[PDB]
Amino acid sequence: STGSATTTPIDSLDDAYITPVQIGTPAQTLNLDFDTGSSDLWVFSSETTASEVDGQTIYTPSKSTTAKLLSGATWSISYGDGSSSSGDVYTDTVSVGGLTVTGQAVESAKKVSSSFTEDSTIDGLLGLAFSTLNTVSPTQQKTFFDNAKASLDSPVFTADLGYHAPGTYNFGFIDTTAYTGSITYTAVSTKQGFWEWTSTGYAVGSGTFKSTSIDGIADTGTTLLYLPATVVSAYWAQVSGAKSSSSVGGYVFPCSATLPSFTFGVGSARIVIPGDYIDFGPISTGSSSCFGGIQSSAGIGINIFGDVALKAAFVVFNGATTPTLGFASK
């Protein structure tokens, strides 16, 4: 089997992407944030504290003939950005782009933090990291991909995120029309439960490539590119007037700037992030200070190849017995 679904930016900045997901019988379609940095499929629901729902579409398990309470199971998750959610668990039929999993754990939120409430466009998350990170207790649950894997034509999914445009998540096949040149594959460590890999270096604009190992995670659920302070300083030093602002929470730059590109290495290959991808616009409405899309990972504890990086590539998440990651230009 295979699946193919379009993923759409939630706003004009590509802050996140939503993908429609069918849950239950008859189908209830929710728009979920596919997150290769976590491993829980959770949704706003009929059980979510009413004051914490503001415009989201909810899953109502009592209206699904295939929903079953997973008795005694609870979940609770905290994300890198400080947001969180928790609740109980149902199993139900879940389909993505024509690919169906029966008996998928659907984690029903009883509580969500303010950031989730305030984002009316995201109805929940669909985790695509390794199932070892799943938070369901006392019986850990599998991700949608893990459940689908054996049925897929090939044990892979791909992320093809757009810049200010829709893109695609495919399951079970590699669309050879969706990228240019060849795909370069690189080793993955699953020791922390992430799609963790090592970039071979970077360049700023038309500058020379610096060969240096940068361990980090491929994370579709993180907006920006978070890299070591040395690398980030080298980038922003090429933008007149750019500076790190503790009050704003990172590097800002004059909105009048033209940003240089940023290149990262994948083995001997190179992925180029155009300068425009690194512009996250005014820090507040009407400001002439703009927020940067490359930020320091210092104090996160891990480097994160988030959407800013991933959307410059066609990315293969290879879930074979020994997982790997592939990157192609597009």
Query: What is the CATH T-level fold of the domain 5-174, as seen in this structure?
Result: Cathepsin D, subunit A; domain 1 (2.40.70)
In 3-state terms the chain splits into helix, strand, coil percentages (rounded to 5) of: 10, 45, 45
At the fourth CATH level, which superfamily is domain 175-330? Acid Proteases (2.40.70.10)
Give me the residue label for tokens 């927020």: 291
DSSP string, 226-264: EE-HHHHHHHHTTSTT-EEETTTTEEEEETTPPPPPEEE
Q: What is the resolution of this structure in A?
A: 1.2
Paired tokens of 192: 């922390």
Q: Is 247 a catalytic residue?
A: no
Q: Are 102 and 93 in contact (CB under 8 A)?
A: yes
> Quick check: 116 and 55 in contact, CB under 8 A?
no
CA distance 156 to 144: 12
48, 83 contact by CB (below 8 A): no
CB 217 within 8 A of CB 37: yes
Catalytic residue among 199, 261, 296, 297: 199
Q: Which two tokens stand for residue 38?
A: 């976590």
Structural biology method used: X-ray
Distance of CA 82 to the CA centre of its chain: 16
Q: Report the C-alpha gap between 195 and 193 in whole angstroms.
A: 7
Phi, psi of 201 (to 5 degrees): 150, -165
Nearest residue to 157 (alpha-carbon basis) of 129, 131, 179, 189: 129
CB-count exposure of residue 29 (10 Å: 0-12, 13-18, 19+): middle
Active site residue 35: yes
Main-chain dihedrals φ then ψ at residue 266, nearest 5 degrees? -130, 105
Catalytic residue among 35, 88, 219, 279: 35
Q: Rounded to an integer, what distance in angstroms lies between the CA atom of residue 8 and that of residue 20?
A: 9
Domains 5-174 and 175-330 share a fold: yes
Question: Could you identify the residue written with the tokens 């207790």?
Answer: 137
Determine the 3-state secondary structure of 268 from DSSP: coil
